[PDB]
Ligand SMILES: *[C@@H]1O[C@H](CO)[C@@H](O[C@@H]2O[C@H](CO)[C@@H](O[C@@H]3O[C@H](CO)[C@@H](O)[C@H](O[C@H]4O[C@H](CO)[C@@H](O)[C@H](O)[C@@H]4O)[C@@H]3O)[C@H](O)[C@H]2NC(C)=O)[C@H](O)[C@H]1NC(C)=O
Ligand SMILES: *[C@@H]1O[C@H](CO)[C@@H](O[C@@H]2O[C@H](CO)[C@@H](O)[C@H](O)[C@H]2NC(C)=O)[C@H](O)[C@H]1NC(C)=O
Ligand SMILES: *[C@@H]1O[C@H](CO)[C@@H](O[C@@H]2O[C@H](CO)[C@@H](O)[C@H](O)[C@H]2NC(C)=O)[C@H](O)[C@H]1NC(C)=O
């Protein structure tokens with residue numbers, strides 16, 4: 001039914017530039033130039049939309065519903081780093097701060113009346129670290145149950161081992177279902 | 183440095199009036215919206231007052247920045263969040279915040295405000311955003327926060343949906359309907375759409391406050407209470423000009439939301455009088471201390487307390503008891519109002 005998508009704005013991302021020589025037939029070398037943020041430099045920015053493909057007009061431009069992002073992320077630079085559909089009308093996003101030791105999962109439902117997506121702050125889910133960064137490379141992805149009211153997700157436990165946790169969508173606390181020195 | 187270094191309550195503060203200079207500057211740049219300054223610092227000075235200019239040249243300060251915030255869903259949510267934090271920076275343990283949802287929208291909005299083009303942000307989307315921000319902030323900075331939706335006096339057209347929103351977002355931080363704007367606009371309190379909103383408010387359980395008596399007759403206050411059925415009064419100062427109403431109000435236990443430093447700067451209080459407030463102190467009246475618009479008055483809640491303490495001999499014993507009235511008069515559900523007081527009594531070294 002729905003097509004979710006991201007939009008990246010590279011407007012002020014500096015360019016890396018390097019020469020490309022091509023076949024010997026090419027008299028003057030080409031300068032490849034690419035938007036690429038080196039460390040500390042200016043990052044892209046991102047926005048996230050969902051559109052409904054069943055109701056597409058051909059007489060009107062098609063309507064995309066933006067899903068803003070956590071106010072706890074908007075106070076500074078951030079990244080969109082996971083999106084996972086949970087049900088036919090439920091979608092989960094994971095945002096991450098430019099300083100990558102704090103991340104936030106949102107869970108959004110289609111709102112039949114408004115026509116929009118609404119994510120209640122009481123289904124939000126924080127994940128953080130003080131020894132390092134969140135995730136092996138990025139935060140893990142949720143695996144929801146059929147009805148989409150709970151999910152399993154690989155998070156790092158009390159003694160720092162990565163094991164499967166079991167969350168309820170509107171409950172801060174999870175239960176580990178595996179433990180061990182592995 | 184603090185004037186009253188204990189848990190406080192605040193009932194009268196405007197969101198549009200309490201924004202960070204830095205994040206106005208940020209959203210200006212991003213959107214390519216022109217701005218009188220370029221340092222976050224010296225921008226505060228162009229928007230902020232220190233001399234007591236008056237209500238004409240005050241409302242002009244909004245035009246400086248509002249264009250940069252409005253119409254930008256990202257900003258609405260952020261200023262809400264950043265606000266909760268600035269209250270946690272003062273003593274505040276519970277706040278009610280007021281803003282006009284229509285003044286931040288750029289779509290489905292009578293006169294589109296602040297000169298912006300159409301138009302994607304509906305005033306519904308706005309309240310939603312603001313809520314999501316206040317709720318995230320309550321959690322992250324630990325201050326209880328509820329919101330108050332404003333009707334504008336010169337625009338009685340809007341006040342229909344204002345109270346309708348109030349009803350649907352009851353479950354999410356909105357607890358009461360306000361009515362700021364211009365007081366000295368001919369018979370405003372009586373406008374048809376305005377009174378019918380406050381009618382629906384009473385009929386639907388939605389609590390009611392009204393900006394009335396700030397700079398305007400004691401009759402403005404009269405209509406607020408009688409025709410409009412207000413439970414609290416924004417400012418209320420020139421009600422000390424009708425002793426029958428004043429004394430029948432203390433009788434019925436009316437709450438007065440009072441802004442000391444705001445009064446000086448708006449011109450509503452002239453410095454050659456005793457402040458409206460000092461009377462309220464000796465008269466054992468139900469009242470609270472607020473701030474209205476910190477960004478524009480360049481203030482923190484401490485300034486309104488530092489003023490009351492220094493300029494007019496307020497003592498900790500008074501400060502404690504008016505913060506109690508505040509909670510008592512607050513628009514919380516009874517059970518949570520109780521636990522607020524519990525929190526207050528305890529940190530004041532009083533019982534249960
Ligand atoms: C992606 O990101 C970039 C930068 O973050 C963002 O670029 C900015 O967009 C705005 C809006 O187009 C630009 O600001 C405009 O600049 C032009 C050109 O000089 C002006 O004509 C604009 O109009 C102003 O005046 C009008 C009438 O007075 C008004 O109608 C209007 O509201 C303005 O007041 C305006 O100043 C800004 O310059 C760029 N910034 C940069 C660095 O390029 C862009 O919008 C983003 N795009 C997407 C798809 O997200
Ligand atoms: C897949 O997507 C949607 C949502 O699951 C389904 O269409 C919905 O059907 C419900 C229940 O019958 C209706 O009340 C809604 O009008 C539909 N949702 C929306 C918002 O469009 C649809 O049934 C599924 N696909 C098919 C064709 O089976
Ligand atoms: C993520 O990392 C930041 C930076 O590494 C952490 O904050 C640091 O830790 C403590 C307390 O804040 C201070 O001694 C350091 O000065 C902080 N560093 C700076 C300059 O930020 C923070 O604990 C981590 N998690 C977050 C941001 O929630």
Ligand SMILES: *[C@@H]1O[C@H](CO)[C@@H](O)[C@H](O)[C@H]1NC(C)=O
Pocket residue numbers: 059060061
């Ligand atoms: C739709 O897209 C753009 C608006 O951004 C415009 O130039 C075009 O005229 C529009 N046309 C339709 C198909 O509605």
Ligand SMILES: [Zn+2]
Pocket residue numbers: 194196362393416474
């Ligand atoms: Zn006010």
